[PDB]
Design a protein around this ligand. Structure first.
Ligand SMILES: [Zn+2]
Ligand SMILES: [Zn+2]
Length: 51
């Protein structure tokens, strides 16, 4: 629907909000390999650890 990165409707698969700071993100825009929901990484790249 919408996503704070691209701000575009198209790849409207299974969007994910970051729990911490409520940024709406596509699984694509979060991580290009990611297509299914991470029931754990309820995060966005900034919040996700450098590991
Ligand atoms: Zn997006
Ligand atoms: Zn975040």
């Amino acid at each position: 629907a919408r996503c704070k990165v691209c701000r575009k409707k198209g790849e409207d698969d299974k969007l994910i909000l970051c729990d911490e700071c409520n940024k709406a993100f596509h699984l694509f825009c979060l991580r290009p390999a990611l297509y299914e929901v991470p029931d754990g990484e309820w995060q966005c790249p900034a919040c996700q650890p450098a590991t």
